[PDB]
Amino acid sequence: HAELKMDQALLLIHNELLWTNLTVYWKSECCYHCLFQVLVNVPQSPKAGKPSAAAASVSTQHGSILQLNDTLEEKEVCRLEYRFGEFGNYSLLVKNIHEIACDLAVNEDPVDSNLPVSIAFLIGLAVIIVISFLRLLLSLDDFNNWISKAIPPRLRSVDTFRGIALILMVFVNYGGGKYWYFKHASWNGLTVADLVFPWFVFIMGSSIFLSMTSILQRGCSKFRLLGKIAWRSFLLICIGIIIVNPNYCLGPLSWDKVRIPGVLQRLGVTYFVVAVLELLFAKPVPEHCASERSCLSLRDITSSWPQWLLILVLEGLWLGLTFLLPVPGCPTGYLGPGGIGDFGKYPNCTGGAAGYIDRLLLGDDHLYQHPSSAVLYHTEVAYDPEGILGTINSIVMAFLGVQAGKILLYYKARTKDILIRFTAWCCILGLISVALTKVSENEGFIPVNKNLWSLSYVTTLSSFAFFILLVLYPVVDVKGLWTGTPFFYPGMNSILVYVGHEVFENYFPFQWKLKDNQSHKEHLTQNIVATALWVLIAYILYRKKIFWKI
Amino acid sequence: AELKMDQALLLIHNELLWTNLTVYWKSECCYHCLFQVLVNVPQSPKAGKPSAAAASVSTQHGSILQLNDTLEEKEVCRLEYRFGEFGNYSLLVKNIIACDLAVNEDPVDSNLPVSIAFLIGLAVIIVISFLRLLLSLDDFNNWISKAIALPPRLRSVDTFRGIALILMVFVNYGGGKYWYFKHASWNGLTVADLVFPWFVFIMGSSIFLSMTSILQRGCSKFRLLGKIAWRSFLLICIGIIIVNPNYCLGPLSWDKVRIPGVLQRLGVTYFVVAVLELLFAKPVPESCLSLRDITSSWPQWLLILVLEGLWLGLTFLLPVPGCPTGYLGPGGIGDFGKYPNCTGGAAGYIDRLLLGDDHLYQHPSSAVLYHTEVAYDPEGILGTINSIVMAFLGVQAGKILLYYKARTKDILIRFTAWCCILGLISVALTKVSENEGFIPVNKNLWSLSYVTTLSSFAFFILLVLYPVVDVKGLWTGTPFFYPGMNSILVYVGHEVFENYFPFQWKLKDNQSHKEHLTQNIVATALWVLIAYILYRKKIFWKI
Ligand SMILES: CC(C)(COP(=O)(O)OP(=O)(O)OC[C@H]1O[C@@H](n2cnc3c(N)ncnc32)[C@H](O)[C@@H]1OP(=O)(O)O)[C@@H](O)C(=O)NCCC(=O)NCCS
Ligand SMILES: CC(C)(COP(=O)(O)OP(=O)(O)OC[C@H]1O[C@@H](n2cnc3c(N)ncnc32)[C@H](O)[C@@H]1OP(=O)(O)O)[C@@H](O)C(=O)NCCC(=O)NCCS
Ligand SMILES: *[C@@H]1O[C@H](CO)[C@@H](O[C@@H]2O[C@H](CO)[C@@H](O)[C@H](O)[C@H]2NC(C)=O)[C@H](O)[C@H]1NC(C)=O
Ligand SMILES: CC(=O)N[C@H]1[C@H](Oc2ccc3c(C)cc(=O)oc3c2)O[C@H](CO)[C@@H](O)[C@@H]1O
Ligand SMILES: CC(=O)N[C@H]1[C@H](Oc2ccc3c(C)cc(=O)oc3c2)O[C@H](CO)[C@@H](O)[C@@H]1O
Ligand SMILES: *[C@@H]1O[C@H](CO)[C@@H](O)[C@H](O)[C@H]1NC(C)=O
Ligand SMILES: *[C@@H]1O[C@H](CO)[C@@H](O)[C@H](O)[C@H]1NC(C)=O
Ligand SMILES: *[C@@H]1O[C@H](CO)[C@@H](O)[C@H](O)[C@H]1NC(C)=O
Numbered sequence A: 001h002a003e004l005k006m007d008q009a010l011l012l013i014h015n016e017l018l019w020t021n022l023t024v025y026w027k028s029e030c031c032y033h034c035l036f037q038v039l040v041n042v043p044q045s046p047k048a049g050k051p052s053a054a055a056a057s058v059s060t061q062h063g064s065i066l067q068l069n070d071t072l073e074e075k076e077v078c079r080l081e082y083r084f085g086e087f088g089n090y091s092l093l094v095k096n097i098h099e100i101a102c103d104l105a106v107n108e109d110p111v112d113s114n115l116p117v118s119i120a121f122l123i124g125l126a127v128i129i130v131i132s133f134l135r136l137l138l139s140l141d142d143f144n145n146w147i148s149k150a151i152p153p154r155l156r157s158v159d160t161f162r163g164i165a166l167i168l169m170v171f172v173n174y175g176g177g178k179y180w181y182f183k184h185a186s187w188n189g190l191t192v193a194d195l196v197f198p199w200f201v202f203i204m205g206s207s208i209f210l211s212m213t214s215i216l217q218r219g220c221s222k223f224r225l226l227g228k229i230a231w232r233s234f235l236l237i238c239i240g241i242i243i244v245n246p247n248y249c250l251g252p253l254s255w256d257k258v259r260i261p262g263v264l265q266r267l268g269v270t271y272f273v274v275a276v277l278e279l280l281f282a283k284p285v286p287e288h289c290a291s292e293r294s295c296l297s298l299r300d301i302t303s304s305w306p307q308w309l310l311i312l313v314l315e316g317l318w319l320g321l322t323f324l325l326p327v328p329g330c331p332t333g334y335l336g337p338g339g340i341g342d343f344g345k346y347p348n349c350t351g352g353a354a355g356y357i358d359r360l361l362l363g364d365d366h367l368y369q370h371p372s373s374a375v376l377y378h379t380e381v382a383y384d385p386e387g388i389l390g391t392i393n394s395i396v397m398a399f400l401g402v403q404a405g406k407i408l409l410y411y412k413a414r415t416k417d418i419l420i421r422f423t424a425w426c427c428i429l430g431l432i433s434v435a436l437t438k439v440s441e442n443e444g445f446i447p448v449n450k451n452l453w454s455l456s457y458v459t460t461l462s463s464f465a466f467f468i469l470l471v472l473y474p475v476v477d478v479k480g481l482w483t484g485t486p487f488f489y490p491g492m493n494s495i496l497v498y499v500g501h502e503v504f505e506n507y508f509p510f511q512w513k514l515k516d517n518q519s520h521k522e523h524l525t526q527n528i529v530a531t532a533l534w535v536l537i538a539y540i541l542y543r544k545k546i547f548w549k550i
Numbered sequence B: 001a002e003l004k005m006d007q008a009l010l011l012i013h014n015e016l017l018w019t020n021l022t023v024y025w026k027s028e029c030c031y032h033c034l035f036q037v038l039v040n041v042p043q044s045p046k047a048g049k050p051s052a053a054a055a056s057v058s059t060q061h062g063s064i065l066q067l068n069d070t071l072e073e074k075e076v077c078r079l080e081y082r083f084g085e086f087g088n089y090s091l092l093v094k095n096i097i098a099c100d101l102a103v104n105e106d107p108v109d110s111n112l113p114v115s116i117a118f119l120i121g122l123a124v125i126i127v128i129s130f131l132r133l134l135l136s137l138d139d140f141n142n143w144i145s146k147a148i149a150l151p152p153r154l155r156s157v158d159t160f161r162g163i164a165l166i167l168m169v170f171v172n173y174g175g176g177k178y179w180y181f182k183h184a185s186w187n188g189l190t191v192a193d194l195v196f197p198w199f200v201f202i203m204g205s206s207i208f209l210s211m212t213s214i215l216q217r218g219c220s221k222f223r224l225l226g227k228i229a230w231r232s233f234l235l236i237c238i239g240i241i242i243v244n245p246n247y248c249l250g251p252l253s254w255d256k257v258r259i260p261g262v263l264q265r266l267g268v269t270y271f272v273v274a275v276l277e278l279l280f281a282k283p284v285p286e287s288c289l290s291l292r293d294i295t296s297s298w299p300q301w302l303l304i305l306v307l308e309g310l311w312l313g314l315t316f317l318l319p320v321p322g323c324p325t326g327y328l329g330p331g332g333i334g335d336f337g338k339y340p341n342c343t344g345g346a347a348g349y350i351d352r353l354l355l356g357d358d359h360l361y362q363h364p365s366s367a368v369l370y371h372t373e374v375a376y377d378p379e380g381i382l383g384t385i386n387s388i389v390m391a392f393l394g395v396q397a398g399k400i401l402l403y404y405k406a407r408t409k410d411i412l413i414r415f416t417a418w419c420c421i422l423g424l425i426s427v428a429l430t431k432v433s434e435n436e437g438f439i440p441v442n443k444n445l446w447s448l449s450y451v452t453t454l455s456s457f458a459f460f461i462l463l464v465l466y467p468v469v470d471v472k473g474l475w476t477g478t479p480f481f482y483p484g485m486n487s488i489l490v491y492v493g494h495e496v497f498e499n500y501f502p503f504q505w506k507l508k509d510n511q512s513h514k515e516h517l518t519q520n521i522v523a524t525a526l527w528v529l530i531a532y533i534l535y536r537k538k539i540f541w542k543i
């Protein structure tokens, strides 16, 4: 409604005081321990009855804490903790009451982002898009008729899970309407965009076990499956480094500024490690005890105890490196965001041990230069979310996916046992996560961090994945009440969809110029249309059996 | 240092204290250009101290310099030297009025055998590296076990298309930024200008070679018409969406979308010529001079002649407002600058009238030389007629290849006859001159002489490829038909992956031909390798 943009409310401040230099400090409520950034400097009023006013633009995404203290006296005047709307015209008046108090007034009502659209506009847009697609499909055959008138099967629950993850990833990678909850969490906590990648690693591990056991029971030597695993991991790493990581619109690729790690690099490294582990210890899948009712046998874990032992050793290594690796110019065992986080006393300390290891082994230029904490915590250093330390927890979560595959493939005709074990695993992983985080975004022993790929992050997302599998496997596999109707085509063409949406970022169907580039509705509509078009492309590549696999 | 690629720093010293000298430059290859001012050199402040002015002159080909006084407006000397890349030329002029132009530093001249011998050396090095990398694949693994469509594709059309694809991948990436590996500014023929017409010719030949097989094997005409229409629509949509816009500048908008394009023109011509062939389709029949391939296509020939007449009439007779009728010139400063905004003439006027100025090629091939300020699309509306004509010439080549399958001599005789006829037509039209003649060879207008010249070249290439690769089998096209079978995928990939690392990386110095040429050769070799890899796995993409 003004020169504002993208969750930014203009806050006029009337310094009605006569002889006080007033400065205005602001800090979002999302910050755990952040410095009070300077917002605006409102000078003293020249005379009584003629206040001096200045214009400042506060944020809107999540809360706002305003601190007013005298610039010269360095004494607090008053504090506010308002939640300014998207395009509000809030006005703050500070004046003597008789000591000094500030009054906040809402000159113009906010647009109330996500309140107006809520679910009503979402349902309306979905219905309109569906009607338009159906009309286009029906009228498409009209042109063809005018001329005539003139003269071991793939598991479907895993496919639906991967399709859900892929749809969510395509939505949140394109922006997801540029909403704060559809983007990545700044440093800690969990958002909608933070869920997909751990789910992808979990499904990768489950598919690793499924494919491994299917190929081995087909009568194939381990020395050929090892070559397949190594080649697939190498292809993943190379594809990521060459195609996915760099933004070639900026310019040609130069090794001095090549981002070595990435999503596909991490996927390939973890795939190689966990698949080679499973190949090394690959027990044949045994038949059930013919009861299949409420069997308590833990043969699934007692047949994979070496893999579990090595995974726990790796997790202990991750904990030791995170909490006991002296980082120069940084507290040992740091988990904060740096920049202005933790009151700003460690500005060049994003990540801590993981960031130090990344900057040491790979160099500062070979890391993600725009980490998710840069926007909020003002981190000036380069931290890569897919670093080296986090690869250990990525391997751990891939192995948890392997465990889920073991659960769902050992007891193939014992769906009650499958659900019992999925419930048990979800419960125990949730208990571990709730012990580590203590139900807190930034408190607890190990908060839910994606950039660090925290152990609590892995446990929380693995519990979510186990619950999702518990919901999907009966409905989509056993009961058959559902088939993942809009989901499993991306589930089958995951790699194709990922590579395509990484390449065809700005292409017209997935991205077009907007009338209002600072509108949430326009961005959300564009991102939803792009996601729906990627689902349509995956469905087309399913109808014509074009399944790209590595 | 301060110089750029294909430029020489021309120092100019004037020993005259009574006449300021302004320096006018004009490239030798331009037909009729205004003498654009190069540098203004003031008079010498005192005797024995000539004023020094430094200017950079294009060294690609020719440099006509005229010095005339800025006050008396009278010329003092004229020189037509052809400078060299990264040179250092000092031009001293004194009252004796004569101009010396003594060269100080010898030019690098990267267009010299440093682009031939070095190219061969780079190719040898790349081949050796690839062979060494491929050799150590199975031997190491073995040593580690101790520690533990009724007829086949012609392959001549495929080799021709593969040559065209290699050329397009090389010259689209820049081709070393050489002047002869780019599109000639308006009239003229270069290595880049030869690619697209060959693609249209091969498209027509494949149109016939596939249409007759489809009709003879198991299919009807209505399903084939549906397939032709769907393929044309797909090509047009791909050209509009994926290929034409360069999305690195931002999201697509309708006010800045280029409606014409390479694939749009190919799809439109495919639709038109394939529909004509399907409508007038007759079985192929099994004589030193039969002439059946024309008696069996006389209706299509009549339609093509009518289309050619329409193209000629529109080009030479459509009244362009604020422009002479029958204008084949480039506008800008071309044709003595009397038509600053007339690029294309009738074809450009039709494009701007129908599709609008905003939906055209913002940066045509004449902007670099003739300084045109208007938008002219080489793949416009009017040139589609000549594209259809050459697609039908390719269809005629396919008719020759398919009628006389039994008698190879009956194919070579027709090929040499058609090549000679089209070469004679082109010689008559252009008067063996790039800028003279009735209709000079011009890719931007897709001139009729351009179509005839490139079709004669294509007929000669087919006449030298069909025997060698098919009749006696001297040489299958080892680096050629692998892209020949994946043409559409190769084009789409190099139109999508222009900037990706294997095909493009950062250079030590962007103003160097030995670097750009190596980059483009590596990219083309990698595209040939990718097409070969897809051929090995049989992942051919069609439609
Ligand atoms: C890389 C990626 C394809 C690996 O996932 P996957 O589950 O291993 O995917 P694929 O379908 O490629 O699986 C490969 C093999 O898994 C096996 N498999 C997969 N699903 C299976 C199932 N439901 N039942 C049995 N086997 C299965 C098969 O053997 C398949 O190969 P085959 O069909 O040739 O035998 C996938 O995780 C991905 O697309 N990642 C990129 C997305 C991402 O990481 N996003 C993060 C945010 S950017
Ligand atoms: C592929 C392209 C050249 C035109 O297609 P084509 O020449 O007809 O080749 P395709 O490989 O698409 O083949 C299409 C048909 O020709 C057939 N065909 C091609 N060569 C053949 C041969 N030698 N013998 C028999 N049939 C042949 C194919 O089998 C297919 O027929 P089907 O319908 O029976 O499957 C075109 O789409 C393209 O690549 N354009 C980009 C290149 C370009 O224009 N560059 C300009 C510079 S940017
Ligand atoms: C705004 O002014 C208040 C009032 O002084 C500051 O509060 C104290 O500032 C001193 C700095 O001299 C600190 O040592 C104290 O810890 C602060 N708190 C208390 C309770 O005394 C406040 O810090 C000022 N704002 C900023 C951003 O510095
Ligand atoms: C769900 C998610 O965002 N995952 C990873 C993320 O993927 C992305 C992130 C952003 C984009 C962008 C901006 C556009 C696009 O079209 O493609 C993307 C893909 O890239 C970062 C590492 O490269 C990490 O923050 C995340 O692990
Ligand atoms: C030999 C040839 O390719 N000619 C066509 C030409 O191709 C090009 C030209 C330029 C580029 C560029 C700039 C980058 C790229 O990576 O791709 C290209 C492809 O595009 C113009 C119309 O689009 C016309 O001059 C011709 O039809
Ligand atoms: C407030 O600051 C201004 C300079 O920005 C200064 O001129 C003025 O005197 C200050 N007010 C007081 C009361 O010191
Ligand atoms: C906010 O309200 C004040 C009150 O007068 C007004 O002057 C100002 O223009 C308003 N802001 C906008 C953006 O309309
Ligand atoms: C050359 O140009 C200068 C401008 O600096 C001018 O003063 C001088 O008169 C000119 N020479 C002649 C001969 O007019």
Ligand SMILES: *[C@@H]1O[C@H](CO)[C@@H](O)[C@H](O)[C@H]1NC(C)=O
Residues within 6 Å of the ligand: B024, B034, B035, B036, B066, B067, B068, B069, B073, B074, B075
């Ligand atoms: C330079 O001066 C000469 C002298 O008359 C003139 O003929 C020529 O056209 C001039 N060059 C231009 C105007 O480009």
Ligand SMILES: *[C@@H]1O[C@H](CO)[C@@H](O)[C@H](O)[C@H]1NC(C)=O
Residues within 6 Å of the ligand: B001, B009, B088, B104, B105
């Ligand atoms: C060109 O030669 C002159 C005369 O020797 C010299 O002063 C000048 O620096 C040279 N230019 C370059 C770029 O070396």
